[PDB]
Design a protein around this ligand. Structure first.
Ligand code: NA
Ligand code: ZN
Ligand code: ZN
Length: 230
């Protein structure tokens, strides 16, 4: 079953199979003293893998690559970071040094640079406006509008009907929107509505932190964020 913070010591990574050729990766990291789990995604594309998000730091990301080689045995050739925070880009230097081509939107790259985070090598164009969608290997990348951050992207895997929301989507047990220092609380519910409208057929929704669920994670996120904003 789906691993939680208690089952993953900081520095270890678990993989969880979501569908044929689709896995989440789960890592843990200390932030402001406390340990949190974090998810990303792995998608098979023929005999190579596309990585979505780092495992939140260099050591975790090196462990991620090791766990991928052990469990899956296919090379990660490209990676996309879904926003500029450390749980998404921390580890990019490890990926790049391992031969993985790293990508993010221009906005994410600029914000990462400004924050002193690692910076993905390549820009993902065509994602500047809310509702924009582009194909990238076996996934579609979608910019729903500002939410957890202004740059946040979501990822859909058409072959599996799996929607990876990153931090624009919250898990069902969540009662608050979490770290909102960079968030746009006024726009976030609208951004979620765009996701709902564009991916009504999604069967699994994976949040950036915590348990995957169904489409209800989307409405739940809008609700929490509205209640948070008050
Ligand atoms: Na690899
Ligand atoms: Zn974030
Ligand atoms: Zn986060």
């Amino acid at each position: 079953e789906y691993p939680t913070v208690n089952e993953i010591p900081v520095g270890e990574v678990r993989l969880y199979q979501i569908a044929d050729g689709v896995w989440s990766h789960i890592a843990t990291q200390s932030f402001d003293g406390a340990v949190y789990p974090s998810n990303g995604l792995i998608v098979r594309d023929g005999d190579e893998l596309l990585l979505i998000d780092t495992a939140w730091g260099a050591k975790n990301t090196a462990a991620l690559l090791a766990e991928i080689e052990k469990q899956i045995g296919l090379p990660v050739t490209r990676a996309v970071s879904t926003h500029f925070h450390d749980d998404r880009v921390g580890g990019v230097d490890v990926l790049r040094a391992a031969g993985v081509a790293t990508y993010a939107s221009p906005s994410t790259r600029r914000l990462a640079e400004a924050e002193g985070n690692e910076i993905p090598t390549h820009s993902l164009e065509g994602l500047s406006s809310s509702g924009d969608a582009v194909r990238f290997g076996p996934v579609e990348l979608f910019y729903p509008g500002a939410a957890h951050s202004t740059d946040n992207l979501v990822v859909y895997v058409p072959s599996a009907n799996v929607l990876y929301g990153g931090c624009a989507v919250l898990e069902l047990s969540s009662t608050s929107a979490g770290n909102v220092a960079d968030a746009d609380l006024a726009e976030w519910p609208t951004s979620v509505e765009r996701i709902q409208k564009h991916y009504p057929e999604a069967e699994v929704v994976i949040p950036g932190h915590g348990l995957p669920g169904g489409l209800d994670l989307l409405q739940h996120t809008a609700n929490v964020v509205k209640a948070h904003k008050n």
